Amino acid sequence: DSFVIRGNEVSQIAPGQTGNIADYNYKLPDDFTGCVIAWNSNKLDSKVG
Amino acid sequence: FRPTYGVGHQPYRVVVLSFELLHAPATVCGPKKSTNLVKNKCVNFNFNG
């Protein structure tokens, strides 16, 4: 699953962690097996304004 | 997003991989470092099992 999030919200994608993006529009289990890969990309997403 | 946002407000692209291990018909796995061939010497071989 690929998408884009904010900076201080990368912490909410973790097993068993509650928040505002995890509890409202994307939530992964507490018994999750796999892993996550995030690399800062604000060179292709931020516009002037 | 704008190019003046702090690192906490910057966009971040993220990919999460979710596996499955229960009853799996192994379909996606493989390094398979290919055997270099040796001839005419009594050698330990293991061809595809």
Epitope: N8, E9, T18, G19, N20, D23, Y24 | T4, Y5, G6, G8, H9
Partner: antibody, heavy 118, light 109 residues
Framework: EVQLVESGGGLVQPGGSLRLSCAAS????????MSWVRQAPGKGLEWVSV???????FYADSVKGRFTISRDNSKNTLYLQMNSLRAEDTAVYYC????????????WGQGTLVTVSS | EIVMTQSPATLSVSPGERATLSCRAS??????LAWYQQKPGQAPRLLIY???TRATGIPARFSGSGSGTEFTLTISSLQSEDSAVYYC???????????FGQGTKLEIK
């Protein structure tokens, strides 16, 4: 009017416990972001604690481990249990529904004083 | 934790004129702000949120400004009852978070 009225304010000896209660009307709390704030006499305000709409709660560090927010959704009310009130916790405590980017905090509580023996 | 500094602390201006109060941040607060006028004796009241948007009901007589690290509140013509305390609240960290100012005391004559 849409409102939350509070009770429990008073005096308690140090090390003692207390529980502040917050009641609401004409509006639900379970599905509304609730946040308890407090005010030291004469000073500004500070976010103390919050309970979400899914149940995931949070508390400030100054009150972490000692205060506990809860809410009786069935009758549209909020609660905060306190213990070991020390000389610092002497403040006026407010119940609030903070919205954020969509309308800043508007509906607040009349408050309830919480001071200690000394 | 962006530290806001309001100014002045207190203010007494004749009725009907303008008053301008600035509150200064220490980091990037872009357009995340609000202004509360907590008249002494009850809960606060939101005046102007975001950058300069006036909260509902709040008399147009008020005007907010600033963005980034610097903000200002402005009143067109103070009437006698405008005397209260004012705070500029930022919200760059909504998932719990808020940071208030030092407050400003405004009175008249």
């Amino acid at each position: 009017e849409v409102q939350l009225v509070e009770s429990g304010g008073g005096l308690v000896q140090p090390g003692g416990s207390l529980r502040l209660s917050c009641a609401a009307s004409e509006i639900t709390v379970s599905r509304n972001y609730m946040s308890w704030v407090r005010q030291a006499p004469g000073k500004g305000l500070e976010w103390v604690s919050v309970m979400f709409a899914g149940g995931s709660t949070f508390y400030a560090d100054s009150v972490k481990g000692r205060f506990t927010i809860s809410r009786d959704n069935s009758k549209n009310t909020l609660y905060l249990q306190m213990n070991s009130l020390r000389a610092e916790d002497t403040a006026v405590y407010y119940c609030a529904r903070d919205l954020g980017v969509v309308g800043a905090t508007d509906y607040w509580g009349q408050g309830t004083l919480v001071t200690v023996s000394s | 934790e962006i530290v806001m500094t309001q100014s002045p602390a207190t203010l007494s201006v004749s009725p009907g004129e303008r008053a301008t109060l600035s509150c200064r941040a220490s980091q990037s607060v872009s357009s995340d702000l609000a202004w509360y006028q907590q008249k002494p004796g009850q809960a606060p009241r939101l005046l102007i949120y975001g950058a300069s948007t006036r909260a509902t009901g709040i008399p147009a007589r008020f005007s907010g400004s600033g963005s980034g690290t610097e903000f200002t509140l402005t009143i067109s013509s103070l009437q006698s009852e405008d005397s209260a305390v004012y705070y500029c609240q930022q919200y760059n960290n909504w998932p719990p978070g808020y940071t208030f100012g030092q407050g400003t005391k405004l009175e008249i004559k």
